[PDB]
Design a protein around this ligand. Structure first.
Ligand SMILES: [Mg+2]
Ligand SMILES: [Mg+2]
Ligand SMILES: [Mg+2]
Ligand SMILES: [Mg+2]
Ligand SMILES: [Mg+2]
Ligand SMILES: [Mg+2]
Ligand SMILES: [Mg+2]
Ligand SMILES: [Mg+2]
Ligand SMILES: [Mg+2]
Ligand SMILES: [Zn+2]
Lengths: 152, 146, 36, 129, 63
RNA sequence: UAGGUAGUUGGUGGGGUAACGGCCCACCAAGCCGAAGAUCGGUACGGGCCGUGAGAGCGGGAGCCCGGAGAUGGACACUGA
RNA sequence: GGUAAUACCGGCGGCCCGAGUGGUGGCCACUAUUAUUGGGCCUAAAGCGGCCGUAGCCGGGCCCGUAAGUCCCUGGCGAAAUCCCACGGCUCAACCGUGGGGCUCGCUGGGGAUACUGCGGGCCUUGGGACCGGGAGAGGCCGGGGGUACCCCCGGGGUAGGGGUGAAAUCCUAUAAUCCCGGGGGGACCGCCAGUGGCGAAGGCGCCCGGCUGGAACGGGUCCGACGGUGAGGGCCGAAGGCCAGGGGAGCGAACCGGAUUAGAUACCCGGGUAGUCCUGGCUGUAAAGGAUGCGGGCUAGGUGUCGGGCGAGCUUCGAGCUCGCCCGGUGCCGUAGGGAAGCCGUUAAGCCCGCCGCCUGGGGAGUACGGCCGCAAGGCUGAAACUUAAAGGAAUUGGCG
C-alpha cells in the first residue's frame, strides 16, 4: 500500500519484454547521446528528458542500447550525463523533496494555526531522512552532511 | 491478530522473555516462588500441631441446612496464636475439657481451606491428652487425667 | 481510572457512574485529612 | 511486504488443487522454487512445468493432477543430523512412509529418503504428501 | 489462455503521423504527456488530454 | 531498585611474595561497568545424580562419591615440608 | 435428615486390597489452566483513541568469490557409583561379577562439500519513492460579501387580556400587553437540494466569491534502483466538560429563587435565572474515543446497485449531455467452499498461509492501599496482598408475563 496512507492504487506503466531495439528506429547511439545532452542545457529534469524523447522524437526508453564503453551495463540517462559532466550534484529525488519543504515552511510562518498542513511537513521530513540514511550508507553523500532546515 | 510474535530463527531471547513475563499472571506459581503461604500461616508448614483449649463453642450451619456444629478454641504453643478447631464425631464434645492438650490437623477441603457447611473452620481435633479421639467416641478406650 | 466494561452491566449491582463518584470522595478525604 | 516466495507458491498450490483447478501460475520464480518442483514431480504429484520469461523474474506454469492432500513450508528451517529423521517424520507426515520431506542438503535439494541412503543432513525447507 | 495477469502488455501505440503545413513525417506517442509540435515548423501534432491524445495530422501506420 | 565507581580504570619507577598481579606505595592521566539489566535488595553450599511424565518438559539437590567452607561470635601469632 | 432415611447410629449380609490399611501436609501428571512442538483477544477475561519513528526481530530476482553458521569423516576429553541388555555366583530373586551400549547434549586439533543463512564485489525492475498530463472532493488557514429566523429599543393603529398545562398556578398587562405596520441596533447558526453520497490517521468537516496549502485515485515502452514491513523506550494530534488571564452575551441553561403533583417529592411538569456555551493566548489528555474487529504481503465460485478516472460502441434539443459493455480504485447488499458454541462472517473474512508488536489467565477484595513521576488545581499514568466465595459470564430454545 502507500507508505503513509494505506490506499492501494495500481496505476503505472506496463512494458513489453524485449532485448534489442525495434526495427523501425533510426537514431543511432551517438545521435541519441547528443540529443540527451542538448536537452539538459535547456534546464530539463532527468525524468522529463525521457518523456520528451518518447513523445516527440519517437525513441522508446533508452535502456535498449548497451553502454558504448562497457559491455556489462546498459545505457541510462544519468550514465550519459556523468559522461559529459552535467549530472546533478545531489540525487534529484532528495532535491525535489527538499525544495518542496522550503516554501511550505514559509507558508507555515504566516498561518501557524493551519495544523492540518504542518502534518504534511512532518511526513515530508520523514521521507527526506529515510533517503539520507540510504544515501549515506551507499557513499553517494559525504558523512558531514545533515538536513538542517534553518538553511536554504 | 496476526500469526504469533517471535517466530524467527534468531529470536530466542525475546521468546524466553515473553514466557517469563506472562508466567507471573498465574497464581499457583507466584504463590510458590514468593512463598506467600508461609508468613501468614498459623501452623508454619507443619502437618500437625498441638495446643491448649480455652473455651468450647457452637457454630451455626449454612443456609440450606440447620443445626449446630461443636468446636473449641485452641491456643498454639509454637506461636501463641488462637485458632478454632472442630471435634468430629457423635458426642465427642463431652470428652474435651478446658485445660486439655489437643492435637490439630487440617480439615481437608478445597485448596486447603474449609469443607462443607462449616465454612469458617479449617482445623479438626485428632488427639486428646495423648489418647486418640476416634477411640474415645466409640468406647474401646478410657480417658486419662480425669 | 482504568475501568473494565464488565461492571457497566447493572444486573446485580448499582450504577458505576455513581460508584466512581463515591470512590473519588474517599480518595479526597484520605488526602486532606492528614494524607501527608 | 513480501518475505518468502516459496511459501506463497506452496500455499497457492494447496489452495488451488482443493477446489479443483488444473493449472496454476507461480509468479515470482526463483530457482529454488524450480528445484522443489523438480522433486515434487519425480514422486508423482504434479504434471509438467515450463519457465516463461516476462522481463521481470519470470513465471512458472504447472499442471495439477489432483494427487496431493497437503503441501506447505517448514519455515524456521531447522537443521537435521543424518540419523535423526524419524523424529521429524513423526511430526509432519501421517504414517511410516507417507509422502516426502524435502531437505536442502549440501549436494542439492532432495527428499529425506535419498539423504538417508548417503547418510547426510541439512536444512528442512518443505514437505509434501 | 495466457491471462493478462502474466506477461502484461500495453494498450498504447507508436504512430507515423505526417504533418500538414510542413509535409514532414514523424513518430509520436498515442498517450503523450506534453505538447507534440513539429520538428521543423512548429505546428502542434498531438494534444494532452487525460487518457489518450487527440491528434491533428494524417496517419500513415500504427507501427 | 537507574544510574554506579575515586586505589576506582590505566601508565611510568619500585617494595613485598614461593610466585604474576593496584596486591601495596611515589608521581602522570581520566579512564572503567550499564536497559543485551550495571548497582542494591531476596533466597541459596556447587555438581554426578533423584521424583514425576507418551515425549517436549516441570520440581528437588539431607544420607553414597567428588570439590568448597566451618569448629560458642570477632581479631592474632609460634613450630613445621 | 422435618415420625414411612438404600445417604446419620447399631445388627446381619456383601465389595476392594491384604501383613497391612486409612487421615493431614508437599511436588509431578490430570491441565492445550503457561501453549517451541501446542492456547486465546466482534458478542464470554483480553487490540494501546489515532499516527510518526530510534534499537531489535523479519526481508525481492540473477552472476562471481569466502568458508563464520550448518552437514559428513577422523584424533584428545567429559572419574567411579547410578541407567539398559545378555551371560555367570549366593535356592531363584532383590544384591554382586565379567563384557556391549547410553549418560554428563557440552569443549577442543585437523581433512572434505557448498544447497540455504552470514560476509565481499558486479547486474536488474516487479515492491517502495520522484515526475508530467486532464479531471473529483463539507481536507485545512486568512480576507471579503450575504440569508432568513429570534431578542431589545423608538414612532403609527387598536383595546382587554396574553401566556402555560393532564387540569391549574406562579409570571407579563391599563405607566396600554399579545396582534399588525414603518424604522434603529445586537450576538449565535448556515434549512430544504442531502444521497448504507464525498474528504480526512482518528477526533471531525455543509451559505457564496478571491488568495496560499496537504493527501489520494486514474492514464504513463518517463526517472531512481530494495531505498522495504513492524516497531520496546521517546515524540507530535486528540469531542464535550473543567481551569488561569483579557473581551463579549442574543437563544438555551448545572447551581439557585418561586408555582404545582404527591403519604414525602431535595425529582419528572411550569415561570425566571449565575457560571458556561462564542472570540484571542495557554494548560488538562479524558469517552459506549465503537466496525466493541492492530498493521504490511500472496492465494480461494458467482450475482447485483453506486461514486472517481480511462477505453469501445450507439443516440443527440451538438451540452462539461443521455444509454449500454469492459479495466483499475473506493463504498453497500444476497450468497458457494470453508470456519464458528451459536448469533453470523464469506476477495472490504471472523477462510488457508508468511511476519512484527501490544494485551489475557475463576468471581469479588480493586482500579483500592503503600510508593514514584507528571498537573496551578480538579485529576492522569503505574499498581499489589490478607481475606472471602462455587460459580460469575456468553449465544440460542419452551413457556409465563408487560
Ligand atoms: Mg544458607
Ligand atoms: Mg483458553
Ligand atoms: Mg470484553
Ligand atoms: Mg534471497
Ligand atoms: Mg561415567
Ligand atoms: Mg545358581
Ligand atoms: Mg540371574
Ligand atoms: Mg554392579
Ligand atoms: Mg509505546
Ligand atoms: Zn510540421
Amino acid at each position: 500500500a502507500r507508505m503513509h496512507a494505506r490506499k492501494r492504487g495500481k496505476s503505472g506503466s506496463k512494458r513489453p519484454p524485449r532485448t534489442a531495439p525495434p526495427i523501425w528506429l533510426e537514431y543511432t547511439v551517438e545521435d541519441i547521446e547528443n540529443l540527451v545532452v542538448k536537452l539538459r542545457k535547456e534546464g530539463y529534469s532527468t525524468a522529463m528528458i525521457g518523456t520528451i524523447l518518447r513523445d516527440q522524437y519517437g525513441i522508446p526508453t533508452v535502456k535498449l542500447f548497451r553502454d558504448p564503453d562497457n559491455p556489462n551495463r546498459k545505457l541510462t540517462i544519468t550514465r550519459i550525463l556523468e559522461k559529459h559532466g552535467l549530472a546533478p550534484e545531489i540525487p534529484e529525488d532528495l532535491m525535489f523533496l527538499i525544495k518542496r519543504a522550503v516554501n511550505l515552511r514559509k507558508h507555515l510562518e504566516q498561518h501557524p494555526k493551519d495544523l492540518h498542513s504542518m502534518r504534511g511537513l512532518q511526513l515530508i521530513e520523514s521521507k527526506i531522512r529515510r533517503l539520507v540514511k540510504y544515501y549515506k550508507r551507499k557513499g553517494k553523500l559525504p558523512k558531514d552532511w545533515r538536513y538542517d532546515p534553518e538553511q536554504a | 491478530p496476526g500469526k504469533k510474535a517471535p517466530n524467527g530463527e534468531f529470536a530466542g531471547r525475546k521468546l524466553k522473555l515473553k514466557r517469563k513475563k506472562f508466567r507471573w499472571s498465574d497464581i499457583r506459581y507466584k504463590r510458590r516462588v514468593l512463598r506467600l503461604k508461609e508468613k501468614s500461616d498459623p501452623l508454619e508448614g507443619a502437618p500437625q500441631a498441638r495446643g491448649i483449649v480455652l473455651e468450647k463453642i457452637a457454630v451455626e450451619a449454612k443456609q440450606p441446612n440447620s443445626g449446630m456444629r461443636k468446636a473449641v478454641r485452641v491456643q498454639l504453643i509454637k506461636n501463641g496464636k488462637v485458632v478454632t478447631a472442630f471435634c468430629p464425631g457423635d458426642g465427642a464434645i463431652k470428652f474435651i475439657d478446658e485445660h486439655d492438650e489437643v492435637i490439630i490437623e487440617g480439615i481437608g477441603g478445597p485448596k486447603g481451606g474449609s469443607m462443607g457447611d462449616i465454612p469458617g473452620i479449617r482445623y479438626k481435633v485428632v488427639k486428646v491428652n495423648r489418647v486418640s479421639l476416634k477411640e474415645l467416641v466409640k468406647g474401646r478406650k478410657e480417658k486419662p487425667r480425669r | 481510572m482504568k475501568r473494565r466494561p464488565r461492571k457497566w452491566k447493572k444486573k446485580g449491582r448499582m450504577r458505576w457512574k455513581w460508584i466512581k463518584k463515591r470512590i473519588r470522595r474517599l480518595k479526597r478525604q484520605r488526602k486532606k485529612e492528614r494524607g501527608l | 511486504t513480501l518475505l518468502d516466495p516459496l511459501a506463497n507458491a506452496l500455499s497457492h498450490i494447496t489452495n488451488s488443487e482443493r477446489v479443483g483447478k488444473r493449472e496454476v501460475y507461480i509468479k515470482p520464480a526463483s530457482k529454488l522454487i524450480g528445484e522443489v518442483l523438480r522433486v515434487m514431480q519425480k514422486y508423482g504429484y504434479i504434471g509438467e512445468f515450463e519457465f516463461i520469461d516476462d522481463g521481470r523474474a519470470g513465471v512458472y506454469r504447472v499442471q495439477l493432477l489432483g494427487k496431493i492432500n497437503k503441501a506447505g513450508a517448514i519455515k524456521p528451517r531447522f537443521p537435521v543430523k543424518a540419523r535423526d529423521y524419524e523424529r521429524w517424520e513423526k511430526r509432519f507426515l501421517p504414517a511410516f512412509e507417507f509422502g516426502i520431506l524435502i531437505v536442502s542438503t549440501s549436494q542439492g535439494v532432495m527428499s529425506h529418503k535419498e539423504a538417508r541412503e548417503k547418510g547426510i543432513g541439512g536444512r528442512l525447507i518443505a514437505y509434501v504428501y | 489462455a495466457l491471462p493478462r495477469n502474466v506477461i502484461p502488455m500495453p494498450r498504447s501505440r507508436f504512430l507515423r503521423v505526417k504533418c500538414i503545413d510542413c509535409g514532414n513525417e514523424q513518430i509520436v506517442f498515442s498517450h503523450p504527456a506534453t505538447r507534440v509540435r513539429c520538428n521543423v515548423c512548429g505546428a502542434t501534432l498531438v494534444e494532452p488530454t487525460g487518457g489518450k491524445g487527440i491528434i491533428r495530422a494524417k496517419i500513415l501506420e500504427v507501427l
